């Protein structure tokens, strides 16, 4: 290893905002009511006579895991470059793109608000494509998707596979979903972290406030595609260097097992050798996923 | 002209909101056996931060209050060293009164209440034959401090919360207590002495 | 001195001698609490009649104390210790020396009961019986396995931990931390054998 090594993030959303349409104007925000009772109570629900609620966010994808942002060691750099390319030319970006793409179309980024009478998801991109999932309530992590839907997963996978692997393509997606709702259904936006509770909003250009979901909360949902441990797929974990599992309060790739990122980072010379003899194993899939969610890998 | 007795909780881990609810339920059951009675509930350890670890009952009929004290629940809880009980004695003549009014208006702070109110309003319009056209209020309200008591429903499948406020007494009219020995904002006037005094007895 | 029985309808009428000895020891501490009066014959003589309606009496003894416990409740049940309601009846199952269910018939009936108890009390908004907390040494007994195996089972994620401990500390075997309904279900799901 070496003293300085960093990657930046290769995939990121902006934030999500809730709103509805009227006959008089196209963008009316969903608002939150507060009573000072400081120590307050507050509430948010769809108001009477609005039949459906809209949620929207934007996504940029960048081929930025091909090269270290900073590296202080010429030998570490030579290897990391050789590895990313050794992988790229055998495929594998398709696999990562398939996993990311599946999560967008499924709709899990809606977290606790998935319980609707029918959710429709529409996607537009900067290359001129449009995708349409008429009903997002039925698509599993594991299983065969119904016809015409399986197909759009392949088409979206292809655009993203490119966005992740070739530079100088400026790829944007614009994701809007519609929630068909109940009579006065409660809505669950992001909460504020404090030292009673408060909810998060954003300001509109006209001064009104609106309910929202934070950027990283959308992001945490998209990248939850780690099921390469213990030969038991279950449900996937949010990619983490130690395999953290918040629900059970544990860690699946505890350093004690030799299965964490840092042990694996030191075997790069051996992986490149294998790729040259090539089948891609779980060990290199994990590593590539972490490099995409870049951060500090230092003080070796 | 007034008699009382008090109960204190001995255990440091006691949940006041859960436990207080049982004493009220007993009072209610007693009220059902003998409709023509009046017994008030007081909180002599009331604070702005918490409800307190003690409860007291106040009335005017000594012989009736003794009968209440003899209810089996209280006797069991004492025997197992959960409760400390006092005897019935006369209320001191050197104190001030408080109301302990309960406020159902606070229900409107929660989504479930608004949903029910509107569902009824829609249906109610059919008699009028006009289109359902509801009109909502503004974004800011101000309310006073209140504490919660956990309550079970009477012969049904529900549970809910009582919201208690404390108001200072002002004298007028004649009295009456609600089924829970609580006061109402209107047309249910009564009061209790604020016996935070002489509490060294338990 | 020997067993030699046929038409053994009572649960005390079958088995190896060690089990037959253990069953009597258990009966004695639990129902002959009166101080020794060297009624060595008479004191134990009654144990056989006692067991003749066992398949239908043991459960009532357990049911009685669910209700008497309930009416003395002071905390919401999901922070209440299993022991506060059932009084270590589980630990007593360890006086018979055998570990498996098909031979240790006292444990077999206690589990039967607890499975039914959970079954008639499904999860809802207000906590109820079945959400009580067990300690590590208790799951080991109900799951018919040693304690270290429970730690391994936790580490792999087969069951959740409900109480958040402080940092730079450890949770001891005596601390109450798993929900009853979680243990009953896991056992049916992945702990059965030919025993």
XYZ file of C-alpha atoms in Angstrom:
697
model
C 0.000 0.000 0.000
C 0.942 3.659 0.294
C 0.267 6.870 2.200
C -2.041 8.719 -0.212
C -4.795 7.041 -2.254
C -8.248 8.385 -3.161
C -11.135 7.850 -5.511
C -14.101 10.132 -6.050
C -17.700 9.059 -6.534
C -18.771 7.735 -9.908
C -22.572 7.752 -9.482
C -24.844 10.308 -7.825
C -28.371 11.734 -7.453
C -29.499 15.206 -6.424
C -32.500 15.385 -4.112
C -36.169 14.258 -4.420
C -39.148 16.610 -4.060
C -42.850 15.840 -3.578
C -45.519 17.852 -5.428
C -48.914 17.750 -7.153
C -50.692 19.290 -10.119
C -53.736 21.493 -10.252
C -55.796 22.871 -13.112
C -54.268 26.299 -12.412
C -50.499 25.536 -12.158
C -48.200 22.597 -12.847
C -45.992 22.641 -9.700
C -47.681 22.940 -6.289
C -45.540 21.733 -3.372
C -46.651 19.325 -0.665
C -46.284 21.268 2.608
C -45.774 20.541 6.319
C -47.742 21.940 9.275
C -46.120 22.830 12.570
C -47.529 23.681 16.044
C -45.115 25.197 18.563
C -46.842 23.650 21.654
C -39.165 24.564 20.430
C -40.901 21.393 21.429
C -43.274 20.949 18.555
C -45.538 18.500 16.827
C -46.006 18.443 13.057
C -47.775 16.552 10.310
C -47.891 15.948 6.564
C -50.500 14.138 4.454
C -51.974 14.392 0.979
C -54.796 16.961 1.191
C -58.388 16.266 0.196
C -59.189 16.042 -3.552
C -55.699 15.323 -4.832
C -55.787 11.932 -6.536
C -52.050 11.379 -7.134
C -48.718 12.577 -5.792
C -45.556 13.111 -7.842
C -41.959 12.574 -6.814
C -38.951 13.641 -8.928
C -35.119 13.531 -8.969
C -32.160 13.718 -11.397
C -29.196 11.339 -11.796
C -25.735 11.796 -13.375
C -23.425 8.870 -14.045
C -19.699 9.282 -14.723
C -16.948 6.933 -15.854
C -14.789 7.907 -12.987
C -13.508 4.719 -11.441
C -10.991 4.114 -14.209
C -8.341 6.265 -12.462
C -7.168 7.216 -8.907
C -7.920 10.787 -7.951
C -4.707 10.863 -5.942
C -1.938 8.198 -5.646
C 1.527 8.718 -4.121
C 3.061 5.500 -5.392
C 4.010 4.760 -9.014
C 3.798 0.987 -8.487
C 0.385 1.107 -6.839
C -0.848 3.231 -9.725
C 0.482 0.949 -12.458
C -1.450 -1.990 -10.980
C -4.750 -0.246 -10.307
C -4.830 0.975 -13.930
C -4.050 -2.454 -15.334
C -6.779 -3.954 -13.200
C -9.570 -1.695 -14.105
C -8.899 -2.303 -17.787
C -8.357 -6.029 -17.378
C -11.848 -6.116 -15.932
C -13.525 -3.700 -18.343
C -12.716 -5.747 -21.478
C -14.143 -9.018 -20.104
C -17.461 -7.417 -19.288
C -18.640 -7.127 -15.752
C -19.690 -3.550 -16.040
C -22.853 -5.110 -17.503
C -23.361 -6.951 -14.259
C -22.944 -3.858 -12.150
C -25.134 -1.888 -14.527
C -27.751 -4.608 -14.395
C -27.834 -4.435 -10.605
C -28.025 -0.642 -10.433
C -30.612 -0.464 -13.184
C -32.867 -3.019 -11.553
C -33.114 -0.925 -8.385
C -34.184 2.244 -10.198
C -36.982 0.468 -12.043
C -38.172 -1.398 -8.938
C -38.659 1.815 -7.011
C -37.113 1.019 -3.614
C -35.811 4.562 -3.309
C -39.297 5.481 -2.147
C -38.455 3.756 1.159
C -41.526 3.763 3.423
C -43.891 5.262 0.801
C -44.130 2.245 -1.495
C -47.595 1.266 -0.219
C -49.837 2.815 -2.917
C -52.783 1.714 -4.985
C -50.441 1.617 -7.992
C -47.013 3.196 -8.681
C -45.897 4.201 -12.185
C -42.255 5.031 -13.007
C -41.038 6.968 -16.049
C -37.422 7.600 -17.082
C -35.932 9.995 -19.642
C -32.280 10.278 -20.736
C -29.917 12.710 -22.500
C -29.490 10.269 -25.418
C -33.184 10.376 -26.318
C -34.552 7.244 -24.694
C -37.738 6.880 -22.653
C -38.614 3.988 -20.358
C -41.914 3.094 -18.811
C -42.750 0.701 -16.006
C -46.533 0.684 -15.827
C -46.609 -0.777 -12.302
C -43.581 -1.051 -10.020
C -45.212 -3.044 -7.250
C -44.363 -6.466 -8.643
C -40.642 -6.707 -9.413
C -38.439 -8.774 -7.151
C -34.751 -8.867 -6.444
C -34.739 -12.457 -7.594
C -37.013 -13.774 -10.304
C -37.841 -13.396 -13.960
C -39.538 -10.174 -14.918
C -42.647 -10.209 -17.110
C -42.302 -9.618 -20.791
C -41.622 -6.169 -22.243
C -40.295 -5.162 -18.824
C -37.365 -7.577 -18.909
C -36.571 -5.910 -22.185
C -36.347 -2.379 -20.874
C -34.066 -3.587 -18.148
C -31.688 -4.741 -20.860
C -31.898 -1.473 -22.774
C -31.318 0.661 -19.690
C -28.494 -1.612 -18.630
C -26.739 -0.902 -21.913
C -26.882 2.888 -21.669
C -25.579 2.806 -18.114
C -22.894 0.234 -18.907
C -21.453 2.831 -21.254
C -21.869 5.744 -18.868
C -19.810 3.852 -16.297
C -16.996 2.784 -18.621
C -16.246 5.284 -21.403
C -15.205 8.877 -20.799
C -16.596 12.073 -22.404
C -20.189 10.896 -22.556
C -22.378 13.229 -20.540
C -25.226 10.970 -19.447
C -28.208 12.310 -17.403
C -31.425 10.579 -16.420
C -34.581 12.241 -15.170
C -36.751 10.015 -12.961
C -40.313 10.865 -12.064
C -42.740 8.484 -10.366
C -46.413 8.718 -9.739
C -48.011 7.475 -6.511
C -51.763 6.772 -6.774
C -52.904 7.447 -3.183
C -55.572 6.965 -0.473
C -58.143 9.418 0.927
C -55.749 11.404 3.113
C -52.672 9.231 3.084
C -49.763 10.091 5.350
C -46.417 10.910 3.668
C -42.961 10.053 5.028
C -40.188 12.565 4.077
C -36.653 12.637 5.486
C -36.265 13.581 9.157
C -33.938 16.160 10.641
C -31.117 14.986 12.878
C -30.931 17.010 16.096
C -29.102 17.103 19.401
C -39.374 16.091 19.696
C -38.453 15.490 16.040
C -38.608 17.751 12.960
C -39.005 17.086 9.238
C -36.835 18.239 6.289
C -38.031 20.594 3.530
C -36.589 22.686 0.681
C -37.274 26.287 -0.368
C -38.864 27.049 -3.702
C -37.766 29.969 -5.872
C -41.032 31.686 -4.915
C -40.572 31.217 -1.159
C -42.840 28.222 -0.513
C -41.507 25.182 1.352
C -41.734 21.564 0.108
C -41.183 18.001 1.535
C -38.109 16.134 0.248
C -35.904 13.129 0.604
C -32.186 13.797 1.145
C -29.627 13.065 -1.562
C -27.721 10.365 0.289
C -30.992 8.676 1.337
C -31.839 8.145 -2.326
C -28.271 7.058 -2.902
C -28.172 4.533 -0.100
C -31.111 2.759 -1.704
C -29.592 2.573 -5.191
C -26.287 1.017 -4.201
C -27.717 -1.789 -2.123
C -26.497 -4.651 -4.259
C -24.027 -6.626 -2.144
C -24.975 -10.240 -1.904
C -21.625 -11.925 -2.569
C -20.946 -13.265 0.931
C -21.324 -16.689 2.590
C -22.810 -18.376 -0.517
C -26.263 -17.358 0.672
C -27.890 -14.579 -1.338
C -30.757 -13.540 1.028
C -31.235 -9.789 0.465
C -28.257 -7.523 -0.511
C -26.345 -5.163 1.793
C -25.459 -1.513 1.223
C -21.875 -1.656 0.010
C -19.586 -1.109 2.988
C -15.920 -1.891 3.542
C -16.812 -4.058 6.550
C -20.155 -5.440 5.404
C -22.223 -3.636 8.019
C -25.807 -4.739 8.660
C -27.813 -2.159 10.604
C -30.966 -4.181 11.149
C -29.207 -7.017 12.988
C -26.501 -4.788 14.503
C -23.655 -6.877 13.049
C -20.983 -7.038 10.340
C -20.707 -9.667 7.618
C -17.185 -8.970 6.389
C -15.627 -8.411 9.785
C -11.837 -8.040 9.518
C -11.490 -11.202 11.616
C -12.646 -13.288 8.633
C -10.216 -11.986 6.010
C -13.186 -11.021 3.823
C -13.102 -7.216 4.110
C -11.939 -4.606 1.589
C -8.486 -4.004 3.076
C -7.256 -7.579 2.917
C -8.537 -7.854 -0.638
C -6.989 -4.549 -1.743
C -3.532 -6.053 -1.206
C -3.987 -9.009 -3.612
C -4.388 -6.914 -6.815
C -1.264 -8.374 -8.383
C -2.833 -11.845 -8.162
C -6.228 -10.830 -9.561
C -4.735 -9.201 -12.618
C -2.794 -12.410 -13.211
C -5.998 -14.437 -13.067
C -7.901 -12.080 -15.343
C -5.137 -12.505 -17.849
C -5.590 -16.260 -17.678
C -9.341 -15.996 -18.158
C -15.617 -16.875 -14.564
C -15.239 -13.518 -12.765
C -15.261 -14.362 -9.007
C -17.055 -12.626 -6.165
C -13.766 -11.214 -4.904
C -13.238 -8.913 -7.909
C -16.910 -7.894 -8.090
C -16.748 -6.671 -4.512
C -13.611 -4.691 -5.156
C -15.008 -2.940 -8.218
C -18.168 -1.999 -6.347
C -16.167 -0.312 -3.615
C -14.014 1.634 -6.079
C -17.220 3.061 -7.592
C -18.361 4.316 -4.186
C -15.004 6.043 -3.815
C -13.433 7.423 -0.656
C -10.175 7.496 1.313
C -8.009 4.362 1.226
C -4.976 5.600 3.112
C -2.275 5.253 5.778
C -1.028 1.901 4.626
C -65.626 18.976 54.505
C -63.241 16.935 52.360
C -61.333 13.664 52.702
C -58.458 12.130 50.757
C -55.869 9.368 50.643
C -52.703 8.940 48.584
C -50.705 6.207 46.844
C -46.981 6.223 46.014
C -44.978 3.953 43.694
C -42.047 2.183 45.341
C -40.172 0.924 42.279
C -37.595 3.182 40.610
C -38.327 1.729 37.164
C -42.098 2.256 37.301
C -43.693 3.692 34.163
C -46.052 6.378 35.417
C -48.130 6.729 32.259
C -48.837 3.010 31.988
C -49.607 2.469 35.665
C -51.715 5.561 36.357
C -54.155 4.334 33.719
C -55.156 1.353 35.851
C -56.180 3.444 38.860
C -58.486 5.518 36.667
C -60.007 2.353 35.202
C -60.815 1.161 38.722
C -62.394 4.500 39.596
C -64.552 4.171 36.492
C -65.678 0.659 37.393
C -66.611 1.883 40.861
C -68.524 4.794 39.338
C -70.557 2.312 37.299
C -71.577 0.405 40.459
C -72.790 3.479 42.283
C -73.806 6.153 39.806
C -74.670 8.908 42.306
C -71.198 9.587 43.671
C -68.468 12.151 43.130
C -64.735 11.416 43.483
C -61.986 13.612 42.032
C -58.495 12.762 40.820
C -55.496 14.888 41.811
C -51.791 14.794 40.999
C -49.949 16.092 44.103
C -46.557 15.420 42.486
C -47.391 17.148 39.200
C -44.480 18.831 37.418
C -43.896 20.614 34.122
C -41.344 17.988 33.060
C -43.159 14.840 34.185
C -46.382 13.452 35.648
C -44.868 12.292 38.936
C -44.750 9.001 40.830
C -47.887 9.475 42.934
C -51.679 9.791 42.778
C -54.399 10.948 45.185
C -58.197 10.810 45.412
C -60.433 13.483 46.940
C -64.097 13.520 47.966
C -66.659 14.680 50.540
C -68.133 11.417 51.881
C -65.806 9.686 54.352
C -67.691 6.379 54.545
C -67.834 6.038 50.758
C -64.146 6.817 50.298
C -63.321 4.041 52.767
C -65.237 1.577 50.586
C -63.171 2.635 47.568
C -59.930 2.131 49.506
C -61.032 -1.449 50.241
C -61.067 -2.403 46.539
C -59.050 -5.588 46.041
C -56.581 -4.263 43.472
C -55.118 -1.727 45.888
C -54.906 -4.325 48.657
C -52.939 -6.745 46.461
C -50.484 -4.135 45.236
C -49.714 -3.151 48.797
C -49.253 -6.736 49.959
C -46.576 -7.332 47.310
C -44.774 -4.119 48.174
C -45.478 -2.228 44.991
C -47.647 0.464 46.622
C -47.362 2.575 49.740
C -50.859 3.498 50.965
C -51.998 6.229 53.344
C -55.096 6.262 55.537
C -58.190 8.383 54.952
C -57.970 11.745 56.714
C -59.405 15.270 56.483
C -58.158 17.725 53.860
C -56.221 20.694 55.349
C -58.058 24.029 55.313
C -55.007 26.024 54.219
C -54.482 25.445 50.496
C -55.491 26.486 46.963
C -57.502 24.760 44.216
C -56.711 23.575 40.694
C -58.911 22.126 37.928
C -57.057 19.330 36.102
C -59.070 19.869 32.906
C -58.602 17.449 30.013
C -58.452 18.680 26.438
C -59.785 16.668 23.510
C -59.000 19.522 21.119
C -55.410 18.242 21.052
C -56.633 15.224 19.099
C -56.710 17.504 16.057
C -52.906 17.670 16.094
C -52.705 14.113 14.751
C -53.412 12.871 11.224
C -55.807 10.123 12.287
C -58.210 12.686 13.718
C -58.254 14.872 10.611
C -58.990 11.847 8.430
C -62.023 10.871 10.507
C -63.357 14.429 10.633
C -63.271 14.783 6.844
C -64.724 11.355 6.122
C -67.728 12.262 8.182
C -67.984 15.693 6.582
C -68.084 14.248 3.086
C -70.836 11.827 3.921
C -72.767 14.518 5.780
C -72.991 16.633 2.649
C -75.167 14.153 0.805
C -78.126 15.221 2.898
C -77.526 18.790 1.745
C -76.952 17.715 -1.857
C -74.113 20.140 -2.370
C -70.749 19.095 -3.734
C -68.165 18.278 -1.069
C -65.998 21.350 -0.823
C -63.894 21.336 2.316
C -61.917 24.439 3.455
C -58.628 24.150 5.400
C -57.175 26.433 8.205
C -53.727 28.016 8.399
C -50.340 26.472 9.207
C -49.648 27.657 12.814
C -51.193 26.781 16.184
C -50.150 27.392 19.789
C -51.026 25.008 22.632
C -50.272 24.599 26.338
C -48.311 21.883 28.136
C -49.928 18.468 28.590
C -49.062 14.962 29.776
C -50.306 11.583 28.558
C -52.004 8.701 30.342
C -52.376 5.317 28.641
C -55.943 3.996 28.537
C -57.723 0.795 27.512
C -61.183 0.849 25.922
C -64.296 -0.299 27.802
C -65.522 -3.656 26.453
C -63.921 -3.178 23.026
C -60.825 -3.753 20.908
C -59.233 -0.311 21.206
C -56.716 1.678 23.239
C -56.071 5.434 23.308
C -54.487 8.350 25.173
C -55.824 10.884 27.679
C -54.300 14.374 27.430
C -54.146 16.240 30.706
C -53.601 19.940 31.305
C -53.439 21.796 34.624
C -55.461 24.972 35.123
C -55.612 27.270 38.126
C -58.951 27.581 39.861
C -61.382 30.430 39.758
C -64.623 30.162 41.690
C -68.137 30.111 40.287
C -71.349 28.117 39.926
C -71.772 24.520 41.138
C -69.861 21.329 40.537
C -69.649 17.980 38.813
C -66.892 15.554 37.809
C -66.533 13.478 34.657
C -66.557 9.674 34.618
C -62.771 9.767 35.143
C -62.957 12.306 37.927
C -61.479 14.788 35.522
C -62.707 18.262 34.700
C -63.991 19.396 31.322
C -63.514 22.723 29.635
C -67.208 23.437 29.684
C -70.232 22.093 31.542
C -68.262 19.949 33.965
C -67.077 22.096 36.816
C -65.139 20.828 39.781
C -61.809 21.263 41.441
C -59.399 19.627 43.756
C -57.067 21.034 46.432
C -53.461 21.119 45.272
C -52.109 18.919 48.023
C -48.419 19.119 47.203
C -48.202 20.035 50.885
C -47.744 17.469 53.705
C -46.529 14.833 51.323
C -43.904 13.704 53.817
C -46.562 11.226 55.002
C -45.635 8.584 52.399
C -33.729 -50.992 40.768
C -35.095 -51.607 37.296
C -37.972 -50.416 35.164
C -39.914 -53.379 33.778
C -43.059 -51.589 32.734
C -45.836 -52.178 30.125
C -48.965 -50.092 29.285
C -47.024 -47.104 30.491
C -49.619 -44.371 29.984
C -48.034 -41.835 32.383
C -45.022 -39.781 31.274
C -43.177 -41.069 34.360
C -43.699 -44.744 33.326
C -41.107 -45.031 30.508
C -37.355 -44.768 30.026
C -33.841 -45.417 31.299
C -33.216 -45.157 35.039
C -31.307 -41.878 35.018
C -34.318 -40.110 33.610
C -36.590 -41.783 36.132
C -34.389 -40.447 38.896
C -34.255 -36.954 37.505
C -37.995 -36.697 37.216
C -38.358 -37.364 40.942
C -35.715 -34.899 41.959
C -37.605 -32.190 40.000
C -40.938 -33.045 41.498
C -39.530 -32.831 44.982
C -37.993 -29.366 44.923
C -41.021 -27.966 43.187
C -43.851 -29.464 45.229
C -42.383 -30.776 48.499
C -41.068 -27.434 49.716
C -41.827 -28.395 53.261
C -38.591 -28.906 55.193
C -37.234 -32.434 55.410
C -39.026 -34.587 57.931
C -37.453 -37.804 56.701
C -40.789 -38.891 55.343
C -38.616 -40.660 52.851
C -41.359 -43.076 51.878
C -44.459 -40.958 52.118
C -43.076 -37.772 50.685
C -42.230 -39.289 47.348
C -44.909 -41.909 47.184
C -47.386 -39.371 45.783
C -45.349 -38.370 42.734
C -46.776 -41.079 40.519
C -50.421 -40.028 40.842
C -49.401 -36.466 40.198
C -48.062 -37.248 36.749
C -51.160 -39.199 35.582
C -52.936 -36.253 34.162
C -49.727 -34.413 33.268
C -50.311 -34.001 29.635
C -53.273 -31.809 30.666
C -52.309 -30.195 33.952
C -48.900 -28.742 33.344
C -50.238 -26.309 30.977
C -52.720 -24.933 33.416
C -50.046 -24.401 35.972
C -48.212 -22.336 33.395
C -51.353 -20.474 32.255
C -52.292 -19.502 35.798
C -49.174 -17.456 36.238
C -49.477 -15.653 32.917
C -52.673 -14.076 34.187
C -51.491 -13.401 37.716
C -48.391 -11.834 36.319
C -50.245 -9.740 33.841
C -52.420 -7.888 36.359
C -49.288 -6.855 38.281
C -47.649 -5.342 35.204
C -45.646 -2.112 35.632
C -43.720 -1.619 32.336
C -44.701 -2.024 28.726
C -44.103 -5.714 27.985
C -41.428 -5.285 25.352
C -38.927 -4.121 28.007
C -40.007 -6.831 30.562
C -37.651 -9.783 31.355
C -38.892 -13.262 30.511
C -38.030 -14.337 34.032
C -40.422 -11.869 35.689
C -43.346 -13.823 34.410
C -42.286 -17.448 34.458
C -40.010 -17.659 37.446
C -37.151 -19.712 36.011
C -39.275 -22.694 35.078
C -36.877 -22.912 32.114
C -33.742 -23.322 34.174
C -35.296 -26.206 36.073
C -35.351 -28.186 32.841
C -31.622 -28.606 33.324
C -31.967 -30.890 36.317
C -32.718 -33.895 34.080
C -29.275 -34.581 32.629
C -30.268 -35.335 29.005
C -30.202 -32.628 26.328
C -32.489 -33.811 23.530
C -36.260 -33.373 23.437
C -37.339 -36.944 22.816
C -35.980 -38.156 26.138
C -36.248 -35.133 28.446
C -40.010 -35.055 28.546
C -40.289 -32.075 30.936
C -38.653 -29.791 28.383
C -40.727 -31.255 25.611
C -43.964 -30.094 27.258
C -42.685 -26.665 28.112
C -41.787 -26.014 24.548
C -45.091 -27.268 23.360
C -46.811 -24.748 25.478
C -44.669 -21.774 24.474
C -45.173 -22.475 20.827
C -48.908 -22.303 21.268
C -48.700 -19.186 23.352
C -46.930 -17.278 20.616
C -49.262 -18.627 17.951
C -52.347 -17.102 19.526
C -50.670 -13.685 19.997
C -49.477 -12.201 16.638
C -47.734 -8.812 16.328
C -49.707 -5.527 16.344
C -49.312 -1.846 17.425
C -49.369 -2.368 21.176
C -46.907 -4.812 22.616
C -48.142 -8.157 24.098
C -46.895 -11.576 25.656
C -44.428 -13.096 23.337
C -42.278 -10.023 23.109
C -40.515 -10.826 26.377
C -36.766 -10.785 26.512
C -34.605 -13.953 26.862
C -30.941 -14.054 27.880
C -28.220 -15.931 26.043
C -28.328 -18.898 28.474
C -32.055 -19.186 27.939
C -31.993 -19.509 24.239
C -29.315 -22.147 24.663
C -31.713 -24.199 26.738
C -34.729 -23.845 24.446
C -32.656 -24.478 21.339
C -31.044 -27.620 22.812
C -27.519 -26.411 22.260
C -24.531 -24.910 24.086
C -24.094 -21.165 24.537
C -21.164 -20.646 22.278
C -23.330 -21.934 19.469
C -25.798 -19.109 20.062
C -23.036 -16.569 19.794
C -22.028 -18.114 16.502
C -25.659 -18.062 15.362
C -25.907 -14.355 16.197
C -22.736 -13.557 14.392
C -24.021 -15.005 11.178
C -27.158 -12.997 11.298
C -29.761 -15.558 11.859
C -31.264 -13.588 14.650
C -31.509 -9.935 15.788
C -30.342 -8.241 18.997
C -32.861 -5.888 20.613
C -31.032 -3.828 23.217
C -28.280 -1.432 22.256
C -25.323 -1.815 24.647
C -22.746 0.856 25.420
C -19.386 1.028 23.697
C -16.228 -0.572 25.075
C -18.380 -3.145 26.808
C -19.745 -6.603 26.322
C -23.089 -8.234 26.809
C -22.868 -10.970 29.406
C -24.738 -14.309 29.209
C -27.076 -13.255 31.984
C -28.348 -10.073 30.209
C -31.855 -10.326 28.721
C -31.794 -9.555 24.978
C -33.750 -11.673 22.345
C -37.516 -11.632 21.837
C -39.471 -14.757 22.583
C -41.276 -14.926 19.280
C -37.962 -14.768 17.400
C -36.549 -17.819 19.197
C -39.645 -19.938 18.881
C -39.779 -19.368 15.121
C -36.164 -19.912 14.448
C -36.250 -23.240 16.276
C -39.137 -24.584 14.231
C -37.478 -23.384 11.090
C -33.977 -24.707 11.335
C -33.335 -26.720 14.482
C -35.225 -29.975 14.125
C -33.648 -33.471 14.009
C -34.675 -37.103 14.320
C -34.600 -36.797 18.141
